[PDB]
C-alpha cells in the first residue's frame, strides 16, 4: 500500500554533508522517524517527529519534512556514520519502512563493477533446471542493486542475490542467480542482468544462442 | 508543547453543566488523546448508555490561543487547563452541543481513583464559571 | 537496565509454528505500544505487528494477517509473537521494539522506536545435508576469438557449508575468483567459481574444476569445454 521511497545508496567523502531522501504521497502531513543500522547490529533511532533528536545522537544529524519529501541531513560526515538508514511513517493501521539507503563514507577510490553473465548449461537443461549466473566483481563502494529482465520487462520470481563481500583487493563482489523453467528460457528472446552502482548501470544480456 | 503534554490516557472523573444531563452515561472507558501533527488533539472515549457502547471521537482543532481549541465544525470552543492537583486537568467548553447551547466542564485525571482535592477545585472552577453546581462523578471500566 | 531481549528463534520446517518472546527490563510493558519488526538477510526493515498500550488494539502486516498474533504478559514483562503456517518468506531476524510515542502519558501520531532488542533469528527451511550439482559455465563463443575468456563451475543446491573449489587439481590459480555462496529462500547454498584464461588455449588447455563437499563426501571434477555455435547474424 503506502510506499516510502529511498535511493538505495549514497556516498560521500569524510567531511562532506550527506543528504538522504524518502518520498511518499503527502509525506509532509505525517511524522517521519529515521533509523541508523550499522552492520551486524540493531537499528538506532536518530530522528523522530521529522526534526527531533533523541539524546545520545549528535547535532550533525538533522531532519526535515515537506510535501512528499523527508530528508535526513548529515553534516560533516564521520567514518562511523557509514551505515544503512531507514525512514518510517504511519499510514493507516500500518507502519511503513522505506527500503533503506547505504551511506558509504569513502575510504577507497571508487571502482566500477565488471559483470559476467553465464546462460544455463546444457547439462543443467537436461536435468530440467535453469540458472542464469551473474557475477559482479571489483567494485567500491560495496553496494549494488540487481534487476533481472525478460525480453525487456522486469522479473522478481526466482532471484537470489548475495550481499556484497570484501575480496583481497579490498574491493567488493556479489552474485545473483535467476532460476527459471527451461520452457521460459526457450520462450523468451533474451534475458538481462542489470547491476547499478553509484547511479550508473551495467547490463549484460543473454539469449538461447546455443546450437 | 501542551498538546503533547496532555496526550495519553485520562480518566473522565467528573462532569457538570449549566443545563440538563441528556443520556448521561452509566460507565465510561478511559479517555485517549492523540497529539496529531500540526497541533490537533484526537479524543476517543467509549460510554455505556442503556446497554449500548457508543464510541466517541472528537477532533480538537488548535486555535492561536494556548489551551483554546474548536470542535464540531467550530460551533464548540473547548478550553484545556491543568488542575492545581497533580495529574489532573479541567476541560471547559461552551457553544452548541446537539441542538442546544450547553456550557459544560469535565475533570480528567491519570488515575481512576477520585481525589476529593481535585473535586473541590473542580467545584470551585465550575461554580465560578456558572453551573448547576451538581458535580456528577462517573463510574469507570477498562473495556465496555 | 532499560532493554528488550528476544528469544525463541531457531530452525523450523515449512508450515510449522513458533512463538517468539521479548523480555522487557526498565519499564512496564502494558504502558507502551509495542511492535515486532523483521529483516531478512541482506534486506530492509519490515514491520510485522503492533499492540497499543490498551492491550486490545492490534495491527499486522497484510503479509502475516491470520498467521500471526501479538500479545503480552504484563506479569512476566514479556511480549509474545505467535507465528503459524510459516513459509520461507518468514525467514529473518525478528526484533521487538518500543514506540515511546505511544505511552499512557504521551501519545503522538508518529511512531518512534527508541528501544530495540538484539534480535532472534528465524529460519524456515526443510534443508538437510545435500551434495552439490556441478555444471560447467562454458566460455562465450564471441570471447573465444581472442583476448582472454571467462569460464567457470556453477556449484548448485548444496548443504551445508563448506565447499572447496580449485582448478586443475590446484595447478591453475591466476585469474581465479571463487565467489561467496548464496543462501537461497530454499535454505540451500549455490556458489560459482570463474577463471579468466587466454582464448588461444581454449582449444589446447583443458579446464577442470575440483569441487569438494566434505559434509556429503561428494567430490566432482568437471571438465569445462568451449561449445562452438554460429547463430544470429544481422
Ligand atoms: C543537502 O541539503 C541542503 C539543505 O537543503 C542543501 O542545501 C545542500 O545542497 C545539500 N548538500 C549537498 C551539497 O549535497
Numbering used by the authors:
A (entry chain A): 2 to 212
B (entry chain C): 8 to 151
C (entry chain B): 1 to 234
Describing publication, verbatim:
Eight dog (Canis familiaris) allergens are included in the World Health Organization and International Union of Immunological Societies Allergen Nomenclature database, among which Can f 1 is a major allergen (Pomés et al., 2018; Schou et al., 1991). Like most mammalian respiratory allergens, Can f 1 belongs to the lipocalin protein family (Flower, 1996; Virtanen et al., 2012). Lipocalins share low sequence identity but have conserved structural motifs, characterized by an N‐terminal 310 helix, a C‐terminal α helix, and a central calyx formed by two antiparallel β‐sheets that enclose a central hydrophobic cavity forming a β‐barrel for ligand binding (Dartt, 2011). In summary, the structures of Can f 1‐hIgE Fab complexes revealed two unique and partially overlapping epitopes on Can f 1.
The hIgE mAb bound to two partially overlapping epitopes and recognized two different Can f 1 conformations. The epitope region is defined by residues Leu6, Val11, Ser14‐Lys16, Ile39‐Lys44, and Arg117 (S.1A). No crystal lattice contacts are observed in the epitope‐paratope region. Interestingly, the Can f 1 residues Val11 and Ser14‐Gly15 that are recognized by both antibodies are in the protein fragment that has different conformations in the structures we determined.
